Amino acid sequence: NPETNLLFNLNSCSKSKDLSAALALYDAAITSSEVRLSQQHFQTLLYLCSASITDISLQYLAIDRGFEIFDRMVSSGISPNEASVTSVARLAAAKGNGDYAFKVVKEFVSVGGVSIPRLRTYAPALLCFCEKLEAEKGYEVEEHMEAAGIALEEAEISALLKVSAATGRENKVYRYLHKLREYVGCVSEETLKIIEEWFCGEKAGEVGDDVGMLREAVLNNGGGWHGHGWVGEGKWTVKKGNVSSTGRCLSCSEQLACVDTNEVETQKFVDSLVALAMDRVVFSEFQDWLEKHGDYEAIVDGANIGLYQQNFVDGSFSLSQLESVMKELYRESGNNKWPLILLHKRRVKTLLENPTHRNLVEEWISNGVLYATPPGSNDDWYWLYAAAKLKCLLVTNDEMRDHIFELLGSTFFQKWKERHQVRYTFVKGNLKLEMPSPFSVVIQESEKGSWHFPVSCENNEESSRTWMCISRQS
Ligand SMILES: [Zn+2]
């Protein structure tokens, strides 16, 4: 059987990255006319041609003979899959042909059946245009990506920022300094140098505008950014320097913002939370109970605080620790609001039928500062909902890492936990609440057009992270 032998030998070439050998077998199949060409033969060759772009000894062969393999695949009556289109997009981008790398994807997305065009399909085009300082054709790829419903990562956004800085398009540079802020957060060392080069450059110091109305724009957006135009005269003062624990940069000596988590994104969180919670008993009775009587500054994971530093074997529970968390949050509250504790019905009873505790537990149920979550369903979803919907603190020592709560948007979560979650500790006797930080680690604009960029300390992120401060002085 010749078809199985060709597929077996082409795979043996792909294991060694031996393009020369597989590309010889490709000729033997065509000229002899003994073997039936098929999708898996064409695919194996195209991936190998894309794989060989990095190899110096095999790149010239892949670029010369790669497109003929793709053209034979289409004319044989086989539509090209996502990986095959990406392979030719990379091959075309390797020899500076951005327009073919673009239009090979436009044909693919135009079918729209089972295409599924990933970012790696469009990236060969986009990067090739930004390499050749073709800003206009670069931005076309972004439009066709964003319309096709594909997220841009840091590398693509940095490429578009780079080409904007090269062509001197100060409108577009401002666009992508907010795309990084929005879709990335803290930036790379390479990405930081792309930004540093702009603000140090002469074009950046030829832009300007007001004071009063921008304050509303900062508040309405969240706190991080005002989001329209540059502010100042010229000559930026770029410098790297660390930030305080209180949210105060040592370079410029101004206040960093603690940005509110996205209001529309928080509504997607709570709806997906109620959707999973409504699953066999009535969850909706808590929803209205919170809304009717619930204006607390903090929520407490009752099961966590009580079982903290207790033996899993003994089944020992600690109301005294849960009592301490109640009193300290009440003190730290300015208006003096007691937090809402959320325990199970199995844990509230047994606490209630202990005569020592009964009074204190009954007191909290009467005052509306403790809610019993019903059996069967988890308490997990009740205190997530309570803190998230009311937008307040959540006291628990539990970084929620699991595949049951996998609908957690890990982009939105962590970013939510850093703003809202309160950790704690009981050193022998006394309690110590570890509050969330008074400033967020994200890109942000001041009212005076002063930017701040945090660089991602990938190894050991701490208070000694370097921030790249950029201000005007006017
Ligand atoms: Zn600063």
Swiss-Prot record:
Residues where Mg(2+) 1 binds: 301, 379
Consequence of gene loss (knockout): No visible phenotype; due to the redundancy with PRORP3. Prorp2 and prorp3 double mutant is lethal.
UniProt entry tagged with the keyword Oxidoreductase: no
The enzyme's E.C. designation: 3.1.26.5
Gene Ontology CC terms: nucleus
Cofactor annotation comment: Binds 2 Mg(2+) ions per subunit.
UniProt GO BP: mRNA processing; sno(s)RNA processing; tRNA 5'-leader removal
Known outcome of mutating residue 301 to A: Abolishes ribonuclease activity
One Pfam family cited in the UniProt record for this chain: PPR_long
Broad enzyme group: hydrolase
Residues annotated to bind Zn(2+): 249, 252, 452, 469
Names of the cofactor(s): Mg(2+)
Domain PRORP: 243-469
Matches recorded under PANTHER family: PROTEINACEOUS RNASE P 2, PTHR13547
Quaternary data: Monomer; forms dimers in crystallo but monomers in solution.
Protein family according to the UniProt entry: Belongs to the PPR family. P subfamily.
Protein known as: Proteinaceous RNase P 2
Organism (species): Arabidopsis thaliana
